[PDB]
Amino acid sequence: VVVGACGVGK
Amino acid sequence: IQRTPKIQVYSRHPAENGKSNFLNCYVSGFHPSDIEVDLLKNGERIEKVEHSDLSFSKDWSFYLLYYTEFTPTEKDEYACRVNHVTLSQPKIVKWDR
Amino acid sequence: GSHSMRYFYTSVSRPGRGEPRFIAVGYVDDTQFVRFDSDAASQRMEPRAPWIEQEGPEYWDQETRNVKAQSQTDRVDLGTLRGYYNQSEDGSHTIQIMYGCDVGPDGRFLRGYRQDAYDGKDYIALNEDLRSWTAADMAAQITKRKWEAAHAAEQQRAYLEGRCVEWLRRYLENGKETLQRTDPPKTHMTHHPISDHEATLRCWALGFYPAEITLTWQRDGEDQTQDTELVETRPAGDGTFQKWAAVVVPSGEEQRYTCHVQHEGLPKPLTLRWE
């Protein structure tokens, strides 16, 4: 599975 | 950055005239991702050529595999035409059996 | 042996031709098993290997949800980074993301990865301690303290040491007929005369998996890396890989040379000579 942690913007 | 694609033209199995096979054209080490690749039989582009999904290496350079069902003979010449913004002209790499 | 799972994201901004193109691929070792092409008609994570097809619809729904949500974040980051470098709105730009975990034969955490790039060059990467960040330029340091303030490292580390490794274990067992198989290289040698004082010997290695392999030439039991040629290991299109190595040798002395093939699918390293 891909990273389930949700992405903080750059 | 802009990196020139390497090209290898080859078959999936050892080529034998009459026996069906797969014609591969592996392009790698390039950037950016936009690239056009065509398989050529006797100078004409082959329709229904499939390509693997876009991925890249540790140095962020992309690689792709273009392939199609083909039948090697003794007269037919095969090649792979590659055009990329890094290239001045489209590179045509003939299949060296 | 040891195994890896990797995910590669690529988002390419195409001004004047719609929204950025997003492509995601999932790998176990040298085998792709999932893919997401936002230009494809399904808009869902699709299987690319037989063994992952058995996963239920709750798996494919969550995987579709998570990575398309990543593509939405990539869209905003594309505009953010372009502002970081004060770049025009009509130039094309690419964000690439790589991450994954490594496991040992016993099947638990060895290393974790998370690296991001912009226009083909390093942007920011997660260090090996999975607690600090390494930025390439000052624009990436703006992202660094952003991810430091939001504590992205803690939740990246949580996935790298947890859900990544756990599902890598499941994939390795559910598809062991493909992933854990070691097809040894079917090898042979070819001879092509160049002149009447020089000749080329090519050492072929075909149909092997995984891609890791070592082809070396020797002359009279001594290593020879002068006048040699190695090509990149290439996919055969059926899951296996190919590679060859060449050496230019004087005529008549062809049998002084030996090719050596090392591969994890071989009990002993092979040695081939032109008779």
User: Is residue C215 within 8 Å of C265, Cβ to Cβ?
Assistant: no
In a 3-state reduction of DSSP, which class is residue B71?
coil
* A vs C contact (3+ beta-carbon pairs below 8 A): yes
In a 3-state reduction of DSSP, which class is residue B12?
coil
- B44 Cβ contact partners less than 8 Å away, ≥ 6 residues apart: none
Q: How many Å apart are CA B64 and CA B54, to the nearest integer?
A: 6
User: Is residue C260 within 8 Å of C218, Cβ to Cβ?
Assistant: yes
Q: How near does any CA of chain B get to the CA of C68, in Å?
A: 16
- B77 Cβ contact partners less than 8 Å away, ≥ 6 residues apart: B41, B42, B43, B94, B95
Contact flag C159-A6 (C-beta cutoff 8 Å): no
* Residues of C whose CB is below 8 A from A2: 7, 24, 26, 63, 66-67, 70
Nearest CA in chain C to B11: C236
Q: How many Å apart are CA C78 and CA C155, to the nearest integer?
A: 22
Burial of C205 (0-12, 13-18, 19+ CB in 10 A): buried
In a 3-state reduction of DSSP, which class is residue B74?
coil
Radius of gyration of chain A (CA): 8
Q: What is the greatest pairwise CA distance in chain B?
A: 44
- B21, B23, B24, B25: CA torsion to nearest 10: 170
Q: C touches which chains (3+ CB pairs under 8 A)? A: A, B
Here the tokens at position C125 are 């990467």
CATH number belonging to domain B6-94 = 2.60.40.10
**Helix (H) or strand (E) segment spanning residue B70:** strand B62-70
Known binding positions of C for a peptide antigen = 7, 73, 84, 116, 143, 146, 159, 171
Q: What is the 3-state secondary structure (H, E, C) of chain C?
A: CCEEEEEEEEEEECCCCCCCEEEEEEEECCEEEEEEECCCCCCCCEECCCHHHHCCHHHHHHHHHHHHHHHHHHHHHHHHHHHHCCCCCCCCEEEEEEEEEEECCCCCEEEEEEEEEECCEEEEEECCCCCCEEECCHHHHHHHHHHHHHCHHHHHHHHHHCHHHHHHHHHHHHCCCCCCCCECCEEEEEEEECCCCEEEEEEEEEEEECCCCEEEEEECCEECCCCEEECCCEECCCCCEEEEEEEEEECCCHHHEEEEEECCCCCCCEEECCC
Enter the DSSP assignment of B54. P
* Residues of B whose CB is below 8 A from C236: 12-13, 24
Q: How many Å apart are CA C56 and CA B7, to the nearest integer?
A: 39
Amino acid symbol at C47:
P
Contact flag A3-C147 (C-beta cutoff 8 Å): no
The domain segmentation of chain C, as residue ranges, is 1-181, 182-274
Burial of B42 (0-12, 13-18, 19+ CB in 10 A): exposed
Q: Which CATH class is domain C182-274?
A: mainly beta
Here the tokens at position C32 are 């792709």
Length of chain C in terms of residues written: 275
**Helix (H) or strand (E) segment spanning residue B40:** strand B36-41
Here the tokens at position C43 are 């808009």
Touching check for C211 and chain B: CB below 8 Å? no
- C212 Cβ contact partners less than 8 Å away, ≥ 6 residues apart: C263, C264
Domain C1-181 has CATH 3.40.50.10680: no
- Residues forming beta bridges with residue C8, ordered by sequence position: C25, C98
* Residues of B whose CB is below 8 A from C237: 12, 22, 24, 65, 67
Q: Method of determination?
A: X-ray
Burial of B52 (0-12, 13-18, 19+ CB in 10 A): middle
* Residues of A whose CB is below 8 A from C67: 2
Length of chain B in terms of residues written: 97
- C250 Cβ contact partners less than 8 Å away, ≥ 6 residues apart: C197, C198, C199
- C43, C64, C47, C71: CA torsion to nearest 10: 70
* C vs B contact (3+ beta-carbon pairs below 8 A): yes
Could you give the strand order of the β-sheet that contains B78-83, starting from the edge strand earlier in sequence?
A: B44-45, B36-41, B78-83, B91-94
Nearest CA in chain B to C116: B60
Q: How many Å apart are CA B56 and CA B61, to the nearest integer?
A: 5
Here the tokens at position B8 are 């290898």
Contact flag A8-C76 (C-beta cutoff 8 Å): no
Here the tokens at position C7 are 């995910």
